[model samples]
Target: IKQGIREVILCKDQDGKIGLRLKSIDNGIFVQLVQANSPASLVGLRFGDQVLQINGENCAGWSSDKAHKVLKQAFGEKITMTIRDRPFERTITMHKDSTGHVGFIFKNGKITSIVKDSSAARNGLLTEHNICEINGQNVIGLKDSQIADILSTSGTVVTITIMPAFIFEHIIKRMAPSIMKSLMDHTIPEV
Candidate 1:
């Protein structure tokens, strides 16, 4: 059994393929798991989703190596993508005993990492869950301090809505163990 890993893949061009890109983020033909908000979701561009196409070309083999040149060539500004998520977009509610612990590090309002032994990890919070709402309030574009302030007032049982992964699996298991799917049996390409 292995703990499942999830993340996002963000792609950008000079015109900014995705929102929040300031002219551009960096120069690259790079590929990897991006951070939440718009890290783009799981493994790679084709992580949870099947890569139908990148830019305007069909990357049949679609290896990480292949993504490099394509992204570079597509970098002049407009990089279009055709993807299919057969899975991955999800939302989940998490409750925790505030007095106890739900340890996680929220950086710039996004889940940067988690403390494995903490309740946050134990409670189903995973890395890269774009912090959507805190205590029932939209938390997008907020700072970590502001996010914490809002979360503090939510009560002892803090509820959070994340963009994708983790919670769904946990929720399903609690709903019906016999029919629930396990994250341990999942995989996405890396390297």
Candidate 2:
């Protein structure tokens, strides 16, 4: 699936704060974090989202300082934001060894360890990634052991998709249980 653009209108708190942290990456300003119980979080702003426009001003090439300045200017007023979701994801096909091990140990679906010089390593699976799918089936919401069982029984080949847990967890929290389960049979979204 394709990523879509989104907009949010946020009103600042009495203290002139909207509770957002921004960063500049590759010349693009991006949302680094949103404070809990803040206006930013209440508006559905997420981590890894690119800030395309701030208060209707283009921020495609905004530096961290510039973005900070602009954001501060809107502290006492309503802020209009245009953003694009960052789909930082990966899909890797791994051939399991005779032991049926993919060379990784995951806890609660987050990869905790990756064995060196093994299928997971050779296939570019990183320990920081949280497994989203196995054999084209969504496993993001599955139990830790359930995911392991699925992996060991899926035969010699497995197609796994992963995304950084830092952002995935935030996105997951925004979805309903039914929507999350529906992702099981749907095609993976585009990165």
Candidate 3:
């Protein structure tokens, strides 16, 4: 079965927004890095989501050229895209401590360190999370330095948006058990 359909609101790189990066893979364009503070980041398209369609066109299996054409044509205006996201959840909110520390670490362009004593842990941040925003600024595609710079001035309480871990784990864990049970039960068995 296919993942549920989602409408992604994206805009051309106006307002200095470059939007999300797509990687050509498996005959589809998948979301790679979502630029922080961009429309795509604000809409919260999960990493690895596939571009299923663009403006109602069947974009699945379309080459990068094909997809780019549609996007380019709509450049400088708001465009709606259809995407298929892997099992994931909406962004969750977390609060950082006033000591300019949230008891967490954002490294290699990702967020981690939800230790038991950390404010992130207490505030409900989890290890399987992805950083979406910091202090209302999109942080999806930000580098470690760029992200760190924002953190340095985060005052005492920094509000962060993250994709909670539980949702991904639940979907992933179920995949194993279910797939294992029906392992090799293929529809086209014989040559």
Per-residue lDDT of model 2, residues 7-91, tens digit only = 8899998777787767776677776555555677677665456888887888877777789888887655678989886545567
Q: How close is candidate 2 to the true structure, as a TM-score?
A: 0.52
50-151: candidate 3 lDDT, tens digit per residue: 778777777767666566566666655657788886433344444555555667776643566666677777766666576555654545444678678877
Alpha-carbon RMSD of each model? 14.6, 9.6, 14.1
Model 2 alpha-carbon drift over 4 Å, by segment: 89-191
Give each model's whole-structure lDDT: 0.44, 0.71, 0.57
Index of the highest-lDDT prediction: 2
Models sorted by lDDT, best on top: 2, 3, 1
How displaced is residue 65 in candidate 1, in Å? 33
Candidate 1's displacement at residue 155, Å, is 0.9
Residue-level lDDT for 143 in candidate 3 = 60
Stretches > 4 Å off in candidate 1: 1-89, 98-100, 164-191
lDDT per residue as tens, model 1, 1-191: 01232333445633443321110112221222222323242223321233445555665654454565455554533445655442333344455563644678877446878776666777767776666545434454455776777666565676666654343232222233222122111122333
Q: All candidates' TM-scores?
A: 0.37, 0.52, 0.49
Clashing pairs in 3: 37-138, 98-156
